[PDB]
């Protein structure tokens, strides 16, 4: 993580064996990392959504509820204090799409000793390897459904689009054609999933692939088309939200 | 009372960030500072700090941030020429002040020019919330050179880098572009300015500018999609590896309650990076032994 | 930063047939652990643990 | 009235900072350009924050005298308890007599 | 430009509709014809009641499956109307039975059991006093109940109709009441649904249109007991018969 | 290093803030010693003069 | 005033509202003032007329007295206060139309 | 609130003395240079004190 420890030990020892002193001190060396892909940057959409991006993760910074606050304030304050206002949608954090994943019930035989799982993203940016994008707590009584926003950039996905896999420990589904694949089709001008089933032909980011296999691990993967992100109570302005 | 409270809430929530800075040479640990401006047409600016050292690769805590704090200095920057930096391990704010000034008057010098007297104003936050009045530096000639005598036509940006190795500040004034070339010599886009911890201003030579050529990747650039603009946060800068310049250990009582070691310190710890070999030089490593229980 | 698993393996075995787990290490003061394991790890690793 | 005056006094920071930001534009021009007021915005901000402090003292003595009113109410309640206490004192003394 | 409806609890306190909204509502006026386009009309269905014994027991009964292997959706079921305690050691989660008619299944549900020593069995008899008159008997494969389907296999629909008084133990001593439930009357439900069973009817003056999910679907969700998100195609409706008063 | 800590200590003692006063006076003196870098301080007083 | 329930020539006294002063110190040109509503909230627009000219040549005798028309957009905040107006210069367009 | 207002009022001496030191620069210039405010710094200091 661009840091390395070293240690200095002063050893003074008498001839008889009486240790005068063994003093240890730890020093840290920080390596300079000025890679543009590793340097965070600031962006703002035409809808007014301001976010920061470090590598693959995108984080909202500002908020755009002022107009709705004015609208409910023109009406009575009871209208301000409503559930519908607290679940008001927000603009997406830059260009991207929303994927809903439904994971099956926990199984000691299938999932293993540990119920929790780690969701990882694969071929993104210039990194072919895996990056842990989410951590989830499974339920032993029912299926678990969660929606994740996957960002996008111009040519951000190399060969075979972008991969999304999951690991439940004692097992990891990241083999060939096991993780969910996504790309950005220009003919439909939208984000398209690749491996929803077993297919003998399919158009992907780099052309026609004749062997598409259904994803494993995830019970159901869907693209939430036209889905707006709900109001967030854990963002940078979560303190103000909780206050109000 | 509720109406006044929600007015204040809207005013503090409509802030939009414009500048950022990082207290590290990498993006793994360190603390980040954000500075933003209100939506309304007046220059009231607020600052926030957030810690990403324990940030969990896409997951963060609400308490990890801080509330916006107003800067009570009445800064009047040119457009979006504002940036926070940290030196003397303390926060400072830099901006340019743009005023319509010209030269003297000749016989019939018809076009009394409207050039801008660009002034860097360095003001820092004192301990108890107060602010010191800014040091004033005139960099008009360098801004003219980098804007090619047309500063209003193109967006100009300023990057502040705090060299903590010997506590200096590198201010790079450049013209906004899609891509940037190397520093020093031919590239007239970037003008360098060195300011110390006391107020002494110095023009960076071409070799001095080339000494920090790796910092060109942290500029505010124009994205590939037409006229889109994407900003970037400046970083704490070191040559290649950051280590403290001094080390102090203290004292330790040895065995048998008979001896003690004290005054353990290395006042100078330097690092030379030749190619890929890193030679760390500890100057005058000294301590003291004493027969005492 | 520092690998807690590798540090625990370095301290291992805890003279009992298992690994010296974090829970079993409530345990003692900084000087105490430095005295006990001064021949196994460093000051920064002790601080991290 | 005190609270409204305090908030309405707070309602002037934006106006004077607008003065400060607009004073940067030169007023004399032509064969002699200039006349800008050098950094008027910071004295304007100083003045408005001083008057914000003034409204702060206004709210301060307002709430202080409000709490004084509450202390007066509590003292009145206690001494009314004393009054009806002596009322029943002598109520029992009367039947004794 | 947008419309938001909210949520509505359906009939029988078993189902709910939520997240009803049309984020984009545009209008194009070509000459005198007014085409209203509703983009991404979406909502969500969920098997969930208003909050009662019916909900908190039968919903988990439908969710939990048995020998057939997950699924069991789209089937007809016989349920109890109201369930109450009748007697025994303590009012635990207690044996709650439901009947799947398609596969002749008895699905049991229980919150927690007090004793893990007795081989207490799902026992259904309408008398609660004669163990010799029992009609349903299903033992626990593990000593702890896991609320498993017991797969009758035969046609005992009328048996489930006329059997009440679910009993926990009914062990070799005859009865030994552990937990007994009065199921009162019984009701018929069916978890199945059709593609045309979901529709949106627009009315505007004399123009009435019915757009279903069989011909105007943008995303067809899965087939399960959990939340089902339904989103339709952008609906372009010509509304020129509106009486503008 | 000396006058201000007792200024705060005297104010806290006058205002019955006993534990805050003790914590503040620990900056100048502590009968139980001082804990620096997780080790027993060899010095007796936390004021150099 | 609300005319939604106004009865085709008949109105109620309570249907109106009392006059409220605008504490902004607007200095419009003659009668160039108008209220509008956007973000479903009230805003006020006006032009500010000032006597300005161009630079000075050798012997440009008639230093002109053209007017720098500036639209100043200021809106009423929730608690009676006013924001300072956005300033826009539309001098060329006013010259063209006049 | 009283104490914060007092200190925050103290927070203006530097601003107005900056006004005073910056008023020395002439504002009109060219064929007619000058317009400096004669010794504005001392009245600014008087006001802030």
PDB file of C-alpha atoms in Angstrom, chain E:
ATOM      1  CA  UNK E   1     -43.207  15.556 -15.422  1.00  0.00           C
ATOM      2  CA  UNK E   2     -43.411  12.755 -12.834  1.00  0.00           C
ATOM      3  CA  UNK E   3     -46.054  10.843 -10.909  1.00  0.00           C
ATOM      4  CA  UNK E   4     -45.814   9.020  -7.576  1.00  0.00           C
ATOM      5  CA  UNK E   5     -48.628   6.935  -6.080  1.00  0.00           C
ATOM      6  CA  UNK E   6     -47.188   5.195  -3.020  1.00  0.00           C
ATOM      7  CA  UNK E   7     -48.290   1.793  -1.733  1.00  0.00           C
ATOM      8  CA  UNK E   8     -51.479  -0.228  -1.327  1.00  0.00           C
ATOM      9  CA  UNK E   9     -52.210  -3.391   0.644  1.00  0.00           C
ATOM     10  CA  UNK E  10     -54.146  -5.907  -1.421  1.00  0.00           C
ATOM     11  CA  UNK E  11     -56.939  -8.256  -0.441  1.00  0.00           C
ATOM     12  CA  UNK E  12     -56.810 -10.988   2.222  1.00  0.00           C
ATOM     13  CA  UNK E  13     -53.967  -9.166   4.048  1.00  0.00           C
ATOM     14  CA  UNK E  14     -51.483 -11.236   2.055  1.00  0.00           C
ATOM     15  CA  UNK E  15     -50.046  -9.025  -0.692  1.00  0.00           C
ATOM     16  CA  UNK E  16     -48.814  -5.459  -1.133  1.00  0.00           C
ATOM     17  CA  UNK E  17     -48.003  -3.157  -4.055  1.00  0.00           C
ATOM     18  CA  UNK E  18     -45.330  -0.500  -3.584  1.00  0.00           C
ATOM     19  CA  UNK E  19     -42.944   1.836  -5.415  1.00  0.00           C
ATOM     20  CA  UNK E  20     -45.629   2.944  -7.848  1.00  0.00           C
ATOM     21  CA  UNK E  21     -44.155   5.759  -9.907  1.00  0.00           C
ATOM     22  CA  UNK E  22     -43.730   7.068 -13.433  1.00  0.00           C
ATOM     23  CA  UNK E  23     -40.532   9.160 -13.360  1.00  0.00           C
ATOM     24  CA  UNK E  24     -41.012  10.666 -16.844  1.00  0.00           C
ATOM     25  CA  UNK E  25     -44.313  11.865 -18.319  1.00  0.00           C
ATOM     26  CA  UNK E  26     -43.833  13.735 -21.601  1.00  0.00           C
ATOM     27  CA  UNK E  27     -46.392  15.167 -24.015  1.00  0.00           C
ATOM     28  CA  UNK E  28     -45.991  15.658 -27.769  1.00  0.00           C
ATOM     29  CA  UNK E  29     -48.530  17.806 -29.627  1.00  0.00           C
ATOM     30  CA  UNK E  30     -48.526  17.035 -33.361  1.00  0.00           C
ATOM     31  CA  UNK E  31     -51.140  19.268 -35.011  1.00  0.00           C
ATOM     32  CA  UNK E  32     -54.176  18.470 -32.838  1.00  0.00           C
ATOM     33  CA  UNK E  33     -53.165  14.962 -31.693  1.00  0.00           C
ATOM     34  CA  UNK E  34     -51.704  14.757 -28.181  1.00  0.00           C
ATOM     35  CA  UNK E  35     -49.448  11.761 -27.523  1.00  0.00           C
ATOM     36  CA  UNK E  36     -48.630  11.320 -23.829  1.00  0.00           C
ATOM     37  CA  UNK E  37     -45.564   9.139 -23.272  1.00  0.00           C
ATOM     38  CA  UNK E  38     -45.042   7.566 -19.842  1.00  0.00           C
ATOM     39  CA  UNK E  39     -41.430   6.381 -19.631  1.00  0.00           C
ATOM     40  CA  UNK E  40     -40.548   3.423 -17.395  1.00  0.00           C
ATOM     41  CA  UNK E  41     -43.800   2.787 -15.535  1.00  0.00           C
ATOM     42  CA  UNK E  42     -42.689   0.507 -12.711  1.00  0.00           C
ATOM     43  CA  UNK E  43     -43.839  -0.899  -9.384  1.00  0.00           C
ATOM     44  CA  UNK E  44     -43.140  -3.822  -7.063  1.00  0.00           C
ATOM     45  CA  UNK E  45     -45.292  -6.678  -5.772  1.00  0.00           C
ATOM     46  CA  UNK E  46     -44.515  -8.318  -2.444  1.00  0.00           C
ATOM     47  CA  UNK E  47     -46.040 -11.197  -0.485  1.00  0.00           C
ATOM     48  CA  UNK E  48     -46.585  -9.384   2.812  1.00  0.00           C
ATOM     49  CA  UNK E  49     -49.655  -8.675   4.923  1.00  0.00           C
ATOM     50  CA  UNK E  50     -50.675  -5.785   7.139  1.00  0.00           C
ATOM     51  CA  UNK E  51     -48.953  -7.472  10.094  1.00  0.00           C
ATOM     52  CA  UNK E  52     -50.648 -10.309  11.981  1.00  0.00           C
ATOM     53  CA  UNK E  53     -50.444 -14.059  12.556  1.00  0.00           C
ATOM     54  CA  UNK E  54     -51.489 -14.634   8.931  1.00  0.00           C
ATOM     55  CA  UNK E  55     -48.552 -12.604   7.631  1.00  0.00           C
ATOM     56  CA  UNK E  56     -45.823 -13.589  10.070  1.00  0.00           C
ATOM     57  CA  UNK E  57     -46.591 -17.317   9.770  1.00  0.00           C
ATOM     58  CA  UNK E  58     -47.976 -18.023   6.292  1.00  0.00           C
ATOM     59  CA  UNK E  59     -45.436 -15.785   4.530  1.00  0.00           C
ATOM     60  CA  UNK E  60     -42.574 -17.744   6.093  1.00  0.00           C
ATOM     61  CA  UNK E  61     -44.470 -20.958   5.312  1.00  0.00           C
ATOM     62  CA  UNK E  62     -44.614 -20.009   1.631  1.00  0.00           C
ATOM     63  CA  UNK E  63     -40.956 -18.956   1.652  1.00  0.00           C
ATOM     64  CA  UNK E  64     -39.688 -22.155   3.300  1.00  0.00           C
ATOM     65  CA  UNK E  65     -39.711 -25.230   1.061  1.00  0.00           C
ATOM     66  CA  UNK E  66     -39.207 -28.955   1.465  1.00  0.00           C
ATOM     67  CA  UNK E  67     -38.581 -32.194  -0.406  1.00  0.00           C
ATOM     68  CA  UNK E  68     -39.641 -30.900  -3.833  1.00  0.00           C
ATOM     69  CA  UNK E  69     -36.701 -28.476  -3.775  1.00  0.00           C
ATOM     70  CA  UNK E  70     -37.223 -24.714  -3.468  1.00  0.00           C
ATOM     71  CA  UNK E  71     -39.723 -23.300  -5.978  1.00  0.00           C
ATOM     72  CA  UNK E  72     -43.291 -24.443  -5.115  1.00  0.00           C
ATOM     73  CA  UNK E  73     -44.494 -21.133  -6.582  1.00  0.00           C
ATOM     74  CA  UNK E  74     -47.629 -20.932  -8.685  1.00  0.00           C
ATOM     75  CA  UNK E  75     -49.426 -23.523  -6.547  1.00  0.00           C
ATOM     76  CA  UNK E  76     -52.835 -23.597  -4.872  1.00  0.00           C
ATOM     77  CA  UNK E  77     -52.877 -23.649  -1.072  1.00  0.00           C
ATOM     78  CA  UNK E  78     -55.367 -24.155   1.750  1.00  0.00           C
ATOM     79  CA  UNK E  79     -54.701 -21.870   4.716  1.00  0.00           C
ATOM     80  CA  UNK E  80     -56.294 -21.089   8.068  1.00  0.00           C
ATOM     81  CA  UNK E  81     -58.217 -17.867   8.636  1.00  0.00           C
ATOM     82  CA  UNK E  82     -57.313 -17.130  12.267  1.00  0.00           C
ATOM     83  CA  UNK E  83     -55.012 -19.148  14.520  1.00  0.00           C
ATOM     84  CA  UNK E  84     -55.058 -18.983  18.316  1.00  0.00           C
ATOM     85  CA  UNK E  85     -53.647 -20.917  21.244  1.00  0.00           C
ATOM     86  CA  UNK E  86     -55.744 -23.681  22.775  1.00  0.00           C
ATOM     87  CA  UNK E  87     -53.542 -25.061  25.541  1.00  0.00           C
ATOM     88  CA  UNK E  88     -50.370 -26.872  26.470  1.00  0.00           C
ATOM     89  CA  UNK E  89     -47.046 -26.215  28.144  1.00  0.00           C
ATOM     90  CA  UNK E  90     -46.383 -22.794  26.610  1.00  0.00           C
ATOM     91  CA  UNK E  91     -47.432 -20.700  23.607  1.00  0.00           C
ATOM     92  CA  UNK E  92     -44.251 -21.067  21.566  1.00  0.00           C
ATOM     93  CA  UNK E  93     -43.975 -20.505  17.831  1.00  0.00           C
ATOM     94  CA  UNK E  94     -45.942 -23.727  17.703  1.00  0.00           C
ATOM     95  CA  UNK E  95     -46.796 -26.068  14.837  1.00  0.00           C
ATOM     96  CA  UNK E  96     -48.506 -24.123  12.042  1.00  0.00           C
ATOM     97  CA  UNK E  97     -49.593 -26.273   9.104  1.00  0.00           C
ATOM     98  CA  UNK E  98     -50.438 -25.267   5.540  1.00  0.00           C
ATOM     99  CA  UNK E  99     -51.589 -27.459   2.658  1.00  0.00           C
ATOM    100  CA  UNK E 100     -50.180 -27.388  -0.870  1.00  0.00           C
ATOM    101  CA  UNK E 101     -52.862 -28.975  -3.059  1.00  0.00           C
ATOM    102  CA  UNK E 102     -50.848 -29.272  -6.281  1.00  0.00           C
ATOM    103  CA  UNK E 103     -48.277 -31.655  -4.778  1.00  0.00           C
ATOM    104  CA  UNK E 104     -50.164 -32.845  -1.647  1.00  0.00           C
ATOM    105  CA  UNK E 105     -47.767 -31.193   0.780  1.00  0.00           C
ATOM    106  CA  UNK E 106     -48.045 -30.358   4.469  1.00  0.00           C
ATOM    107  CA  UNK E 107     -45.696 -27.482   5.314  1.00  0.00           C
ATOM    108  CA  UNK E 108     -45.025 -26.875   9.012  1.00  0.00           C
ATOM    109  CA  UNK E 109     -43.727 -23.705  10.673  1.00  0.00           C
ATOM    110  CA  UNK E 110     -42.487 -23.123  14.220  1.00  0.00           C
ATOM    111  CA  UNK E 111     -40.579 -20.286  15.845  1.00  0.00           C
ATOM    112  CA  UNK E 112     -38.800 -22.108  18.667  1.00  0.00           C
ATOM    113  CA  UNK E 113     -39.102 -25.391  20.557  1.00  0.00           C
ATOM    114  CA  UNK E 114     -38.718 -25.768  24.320  1.00  0.00           C
ATOM    115  CA  UNK E 115     -37.433 -29.356  24.627  1.00  0.00           C
ATOM    116  CA  UNK E 116     -35.097 -31.065  22.157  1.00  0.00           C
ATOM    117  CA  UNK E 117     -35.552 -34.519  23.741  1.00  0.00           C
ATOM    118  CA  UNK E 118     -39.119 -35.531  22.856  1.00  0.00           C
ATOM    119  CA  UNK E 119     -39.801 -36.789  19.329  1.00  0.00           C
ATOM    120  CA  UNK E 120     -42.798 -34.472  19.008  1.00  0.00           C
ATOM    121  CA  UNK E 121     -44.587 -34.869  15.672  1.00  0.00           C
ATOM    122  CA  UNK E 122     -46.910 -32.838  13.476  1.00  0.00           C
ATOM    123  CA  UNK E 123     -50.288 -34.296  14.469  1.00  0.00           C
ATOM    124  CA  UNK E 124     -53.567 -33.177  12.898  1.00  0.00           C
ATOM    125  CA  UNK E 125     -56.859 -34.445  14.352  1.00  0.00           C
ATOM    126  CA  UNK E 126     -60.099 -32.477  14.857  1.00  0.00           C
ATOM    127  CA  UNK E 127     -60.646 -33.676  18.449  1.00  0.00           C
ATOM    128  CA  UNK E 128     -57.529 -32.642  20.481  1.00  0.00           C
ATOM    129  CA  UNK E 129     -58.492 -35.418  22.917  1.00  0.00           C
ATOM    130  CA  UNK E 130     -58.161 -38.722  21.001  1.00  0.00           C
ATOM    131  CA  UNK E 131     -54.662 -39.608  19.827  1.00  0.00           C
ATOM    132  CA  UNK E 132     -56.169 -42.809  18.395  1.00  0.00           C
ATOM    133  CA  UNK E 133     -58.297 -40.666  16.039  1.00  0.00           C
ATOM    134  CA  UNK E 134     -55.319 -38.852  14.503  1.00  0.00           C
ATOM    135  CA  UNK E 135     -55.349 -38.237  10.757  1.00  0.00           C
ATOM    136  CA  UNK E 136     -52.009 -36.524  10.017  1.00  0.00           C
ATOM    137  CA  UNK E 137     -48.803 -37.834  11.614  1.00  0.00           C
ATOM    138  CA  UNK E 138     -45.370 -36.594  10.548  1.00  0.00           C
ATOM    139  CA  UNK E 139     -42.198 -37.030  12.629  1.00  0.00           C
ATOM    140  CA  UNK E 140     -39.091 -34.877  12.832  1.00  0.00           C
ATOM    141  CA  UNK E 141     -36.097 -36.216  10.920  1.00  0.00           C
ATOM    142  CA  UNK E 142     -33.789 -34.174  13.207  1.00  0.00           C
ATOM    143  CA  UNK E 143     -34.836 -33.811  16.852  1.00  0.00           C
ATOM    144  CA  UNK E 144     -34.953 -30.037  16.281  1.00  0.00           C
ATOM    145  CA  UNK E 145     -37.738 -28.898  13.958  1.00  0.00           C
ATOM    146  CA  UNK E 146     -36.676 -27.253  10.692  1.00  0.00           C
ATOM    147  CA  UNK E 147     -40.205 -26.461   9.443  1.00  0.00           C
ATOM    148  CA  UNK E 148     -39.964 -28.943   6.576  1.00  0.00           C
ATOM    149  CA  UNK E 149     -42.554 -30.127   4.058  1.00  0.00           C
ATOM    150  CA  UNK E 150     -43.808 -33.606   4.952  1.00  0.00           C
ATOM    151  CA  UNK E 151     -45.123 -34.638   1.512  1.00  0.00           C
ATOM    152  CA  UNK E 152     -48.444 -36.423   2.161  1.00  0.00           C
ATOM    153  CA  UNK E 153     -48.566 -37.516  -1.478  1.00  0.00           C
ATOM    154  CA  UNK E 154     -52.205 -38.651  -1.326  1.00  0.00           C
ATOM    155  CA  UNK E 155     -55.391 -36.608  -1.788  1.00  0.00           C
ATOM    156  CA  UNK E 156     -56.108 -35.309   1.716  1.00  0.00           C
ATOM    157  CA  UNK E 157     -57.614 -31.968   0.697  1.00  0.00           C
ATOM    158  CA  UNK E 158     -60.868 -32.707   2.525  1.00  0.00           C
ATOM    159  CA  UNK E 159     -58.791 -34.050   5.421  1.00  0.00           C
ATOM    160  CA  UNK E 160     -57.050 -30.684   5.733  1.00  0.00           C
ATOM    161  CA  UNK E 161     -60.433 -28.971   5.329  1.00  0.00           C
ATOM    162  CA  UNK E 162     -61.905 -30.883   8.282  1.00  0.00           C
ATOM    163  CA  UNK E 163     -58.753 -31.138  10.442  1.00  0.00           C
ATOM    164  CA  UNK E 164     -58.054 -28.472  13.072  1.00  0.00           C
ATOM    165  CA  UNK E 165     -56.241 -28.480  16.435  1.00  0.00           C
ATOM    166  CA  UNK E 166     -52.601 -28.719  15.385  1.00  0.00           C
ATOM    167  CA  UNK E 167     -50.758 -30.482  18.225  1.00  0.00           C
ATOM    168  CA  UNK E 168     -47.039 -30.502  18.997  1.00  0.00           C
ATOM    169  CA  UNK E 169     -46.191 -33.687  20.880  1.00  0.00           C
ATOM    170  CA  UNK E 170     -48.865 -36.417  20.717  1.00  0.00           C
ATOM    171  CA  UNK E 171     -46.182 -38.928  21.698  1.00  0.00           C
ATOM    172  CA  UNK E 172     -46.419 -42.533  22.961  1.00  0.00           C
ATOM    173  CA  UNK E 173     -48.191 -41.408  26.165  1.00  0.00           C
ATOM    174  CA  UNK E 174     -51.062 -40.446  23.845  1.00  0.00           C
ATOM    175  CA  UNK E 175     -51.217 -36.646  23.891  1.00  0.00           C
ATOM    176  CA  UNK E 176     -48.975 -34.768  26.399  1.00  0.00           C
ATOM    177  CA  UNK E 177     -49.996 -31.332  25.087  1.00  0.00           C
ATOM    178  CA  UNK E 178     -46.917 -29.357  24.041  1.00  0.00           C
ATOM    179  CA  UNK E 179     -48.649 -26.694  21.929  1.00  0.00           C
ATOM    180  CA  UNK E 180     -52.150 -26.805  20.443  1.00  0.00           C
ATOM    181  CA  UNK E 181     -53.601 -24.339  17.945  1.00  0.00           C
ATOM    182  CA  UNK E 182     -57.200 -23.619  17.010  1.00  0.00           C
ATOM    183  CA  UNK E 183     -57.147 -22.843  13.281  1.00  0.00           C
ATOM    184  CA  UNK E 184     -60.833 -21.725  13.092  1.00  0.00           C
ATOM    185  CA  UNK E 185     -62.074 -21.729   9.468  1.00  0.00           C
ATOM    186  CA  UNK E 186     -60.079 -22.352   6.318  1.00  0.00           C
ATOM    187  CA  UNK E 187     -59.497 -20.406   3.112  1.00  0.00           C
ATOM    188  CA  UNK E 188     -58.274 -21.077  -0.427  1.00  0.00           C
ATOM    189  CA  UNK E 189     -55.408 -19.145  -2.036  1.00  0.00           C
ATOM    190  CA  UNK E 190     -53.218 -19.551  -5.111  1.00  0.00           C
ATOM    191  CA  UNK E 191     -49.746 -18.071  -5.559  1.00  0.00           C
ATOM    192  CA  UNK E 192     -49.926 -18.372  -9.347  1.00  0.00           C
ATOM    193  CA  UNK E 193     -50.245 -15.378 -11.654  1.00  0.00           C
ATOM    194  CA  UNK E 194     -50.574 -14.888 -15.406  1.00  0.00           C
ATOM    195  CA  UNK E 195     -48.805 -12.531 -17.789  1.00  0.00           C
ATOM    196  CA  UNK E 196     -52.109 -10.839 -18.660  1.00  0.00           C
ATOM    197  CA  UNK E 197     -53.107 -10.839 -14.975  1.00  0.00           C
ATOM    198  CA  UNK E 198     -51.125  -7.583 -14.655  1.00  0.00           C
ATOM    199  CA  UNK E 199     -52.370  -4.581 -16.607  1.00  0.00           C
ATOM    200  CA  UNK E 200     -52.527  -0.790 -16.700  1.00  0.00           C
ATOM    201  CA  UNK E 201     -55.797   0.789 -17.836  1.00  0.00           C
ATOM    202  CA  UNK E 202     -55.674   4.431 -18.928  1.00  0.00           C
ATOM    203  CA  UNK E 203     -58.911   6.372 -19.299  1.00  0.00           C
ATOM    204  CA  UNK E 204     -59.150   9.849 -20.812  1.00  0.00           C
ATOM    205  CA  UNK E 205     -62.535  10.979 -22.069  1.00  0.00           C
ATOM    206  CA  UNK E 206     -63.841   8.261 -24.375  1.00  0.00           C
ATOM    207  CA  UNK E 207     -60.369   6.770 -24.973  1.00  0.00           C
ATOM    208  CA  UNK E 208     -59.805   3.730 -22.744  1.00  0.00           C
ATOM    209  CA  UNK E 209     -56.731   1.547 -23.246  1.00  0.00           C
ATOM    210  CA  UNK E 210     -55.493  -1.593 -21.486  1.00  0.00           C
ATOM    211  CA  UNK E 211     -51.754  -2.273 -21.748  1.00  0.00           C
ATOM    212  CA  UNK E 212     -50.669  -5.584 -20.231  1.00  0.00           C
ATOM    213  CA  UNK E 213     -47.304  -7.157 -19.483  1.00  0.00           C
ATOM    214  CA  UNK E 214     -47.844  -9.678 -22.290  1.00  0.00           C
ATOM    215  CA  UNK E 215     -47.344  -7.070 -25.034  1.00  0.00           C
ATOM    216  CA  UNK E 216     -45.848  -3.985 -23.321  1.00  0.00           C
ATOM    217  CA  UNK E 217     -43.218  -5.411 -20.964  1.00  0.00           C
ATOM    218  CA  UNK E 218     -39.742  -3.891 -20.700  1.00  0.00           C
ATOM    219  CA  UNK E 219     -38.314  -6.228 -18.043  1.00  0.00           C
ATOM    220  CA  UNK E 220     -39.848  -9.533 -16.971  1.00  0.00           C
ATOM    221  CA  UNK E 221     -38.736 -10.396 -13.412  1.00  0.00           C
ATOM    222  CA  UNK E 222     -38.211 -13.807 -11.849  1.00  0.00           C
ATOM    223  CA  UNK E 223     -40.886 -16.120 -10.428  1.00  0.00           C
ATOM    224  CA  UNK E 224     -40.488 -16.291  -6.647  1.00  0.00           C
ATOM    225  CA  UNK E 225     -42.194 -15.454  -3.361  1.00  0.00           C
ATOM    226  CA  UNK E 226     -39.958 -12.419  -2.727  1.00  0.00           C
ATOM    227  CA  UNK E 227     -40.355  -8.893  -4.099  1.00  0.00           C
ATOM    228  CA  UNK E 228     -41.133  -8.831  -7.821  1.00  0.00           C
ATOM    229  CA  UNK E 229     -40.209  -5.579  -9.619  1.00  0.00           C
ATOM    230  CA  UNK E 230     -42.347  -4.995 -12.723  1.00  0.00           C
ATOM    231  CA  UNK E 231     -41.370  -2.363 -15.300  1.00  0.00           C
ATOM    232  CA  UNK E 232     -43.240  -1.718 -18.547  1.00  0.00           C
ATOM    233  CA  UNK E 233     -42.330  -0.285 -21.928  1.00  0.00           C
ATOM    234  CA  UNK E 234     -42.587   3.468 -22.560  1.00  0.00           C
ATOM    235  CA  UNK E 235     -46.330   3.808 -23.124  1.00  0.00           C
ATOM    236  CA  UNK E 236     -47.368   6.226 -25.881  1.00  0.00           C
ATOM    237  CA  UNK E 237     -51.105   6.920 -25.579  1.00  0.00           C
ATOM    238  CA  UNK E 238     -53.035   9.264 -27.862  1.00  0.00           C
ATOM    239  CA  UNK E 239     -55.393  11.333 -25.679  1.00  0.00           C
ATOM    240  CA  UNK E 240     -57.390  13.709 -27.878  1.00  0.00           C
ATOM    241  CA  UNK E 241     -60.920  12.933 -26.607  1.00  0.00           C
ATOM    242  CA  UNK E 242     -60.420  14.678 -23.251  1.00  0.00           C
ATOM    243  CA  UNK E 243     -63.242  17.114 -22.474  1.00  0.00           C
ATOM    244  CA  UNK E 244     -61.255  20.190 -21.437  1.00  0.00           C
ATOM    245  CA  UNK E 245     -63.626  22.025 -19.100  1.00  0.00           C
TER     246      UNK E 245
END
